Design a binder for this molecule. Sequence first.
Ligand SMILES: O=C(O)Cc1cc(F)ccc1NC(=O)c1cccc(-c2cc(O[C@@H]3CCCNC3)c(Cl)cc2F)c1F
Ligand SMILES: CCCCCCCC/C=C/CCCCCCCC(=O)OC[C@H](O)CO
Ligand SMILES: CCCCCCCC/C=C/CCCCCCCC(=O)OC[C@H](O)CO
Ligand SMILES: CCCCCCCC/C=C\CCCCCCCC(=O)OC[C@H](O)CO
Ligand SMILES: [Cl-]
Lengths: 284, 128
Amino acid sequence: CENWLALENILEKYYLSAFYGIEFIVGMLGNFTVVFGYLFCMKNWNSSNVYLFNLSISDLAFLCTLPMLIRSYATGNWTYGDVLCISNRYVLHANLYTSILFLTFISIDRYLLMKFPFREHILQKKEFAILISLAVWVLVTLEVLPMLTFITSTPIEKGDSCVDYASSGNPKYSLIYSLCLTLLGFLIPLSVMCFFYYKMVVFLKKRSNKPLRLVVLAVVIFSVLFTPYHIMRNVRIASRLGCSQKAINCLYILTRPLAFLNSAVNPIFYFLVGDHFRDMLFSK
Amino acid sequence: EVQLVESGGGLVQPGGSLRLSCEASGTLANYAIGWFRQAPGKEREGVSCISSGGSTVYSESVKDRFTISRDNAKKIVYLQMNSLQPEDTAVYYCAADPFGERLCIDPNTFAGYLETWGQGTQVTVSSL
Ligand SMILES: O=C(O)Cc1cc(F)ccc1NC(=O)c1cccc(-c2cc(O[C@@H]3CCCNC3)c(Cl)cc2F)c1F
Ligand SMILES: CCCCCCCC/C=C/CCCCCCCC(=O)OC[C@H](O)CO
Ligand SMILES: CCCCCCCC/C=C/CCCCCCCC(=O)OC[C@H](O)CO
Ligand SMILES: CCCCCCCC/C=C\CCCCCCCC(=O)OC[C@H](O)CO
Ligand SMILES: [Cl-]
């Protein structure tokens, strides 16, 4: 399967380098603008502000790894060592699953604000949103920890080793883990956003829009960008239970920067929470 | 470019009614007007809000008792307060948002972005 190995090498060296390079540029400019916009324009933060700021810190953590990942793919090997293998492997998964969770909590915030504009409920308080943000980081750190435990079992001390559980290790355990992570990390938050879109539509039908705009954009962005990646990560593991195996790995490679395009386009949500932040940004 | 003045503050017996006015000097058509109140030792809280389109919102504590209305021709926003109780004793203020459809989405957060406020009017609800 020499031809498929040529495709794998080209996809890593040229496709991943270019796609991650573009995401690094668009992501850094977008996230620094919305972060400095909050640091210099927002005086009194609400729940949605807290979640959006966390989403940007999550994006920026991922964007900071990209020069190392692009340099590794461009040279064909991992040379940064064991500490940087674990920190990079953590940040990539953590950015993926914290991002959909921050958007799920923003969606519930927009729904409660639609019913109770004055934010009287404890669930609608800024201090509670800070607690939920800390909960999101702890939950996602825990979801990602079995992958890190597997990585510490491999010979990372060699300095040039940094395995992907989709491609290495027991396929039976990797599949159970990857399917549980697809369910808890992707499908469950996506369903919760779908449920709250439906609750919003029912509320507005009874009373008979901006709240619908943010939730619909979140459901569309995550359905389109996370679905090919989640299908291929699971198909890559299942195929390990040949040329078919290398072809599936090439399809899997293609889907990875497509899922992380999320971190470059996420700053758009800053402009969908009704505060006229775009107008506030131009004034400064 | 608008200036606000609240008026109508007075002494009400528990269960009594009172109407406040928020009068503007400057057009008011494109402004959202929210009513806020501050009791001694407590934080400021929104009570009622009217968008430039005419949509009204009420806090849960005043929902069954207050009515907000506007007269763009006279540039006045009224707050009819029915069934007032001692716990409603506070200085009532009105604020104006030039983004007419913004304020009433999240009055307690979006009030913080506003430069146009009145001086406040004292409403005292006490028996005897
Ligand atoms: O990878 C992407 O597309 C980004 C990505 C998207 C996902 F959705 C999920 C995970 C990841 N990725 C990482 O979390 C990660 C972390 C640390 C290091 C590497 C890494 C390792 C490399 O080499 C070693 C040793 C040689 C044989 N292959 C393995 C090389 Cl060459 C290049 C590397 F970036 C990572 F990939
Ligand atoms: C459980 C959490 C997993 C860990 C991630 C938590 C947050 C992401 C950033 C961490 C800072 C670590 C950056 C490492 C500092 C420099 C690394 C270094 O010096 O390289 C050593 C090399 O890899 C061989 O010795
Ligand atoms: C560590 C914390 C983890 C706690 C575990 C959280 C589970 C909460 C519910 C999940 C099911 C998904 C949402 C419930 C309904 C979604 C079904 C759907 O697809 O949409 C519904 C439909 O649109 C309208 O009728
Ligand atoms: C603006 C964005 C432009 C960037 C473009 C990104 C590149 C295309 C990405 C993924 C292809 C989809 C992968 C296939 C997903 C489902 C297919 C499937 O199920 O095939 C499995 C089969 O078993 C195999 O043998
Ligand atoms: Cl690997």
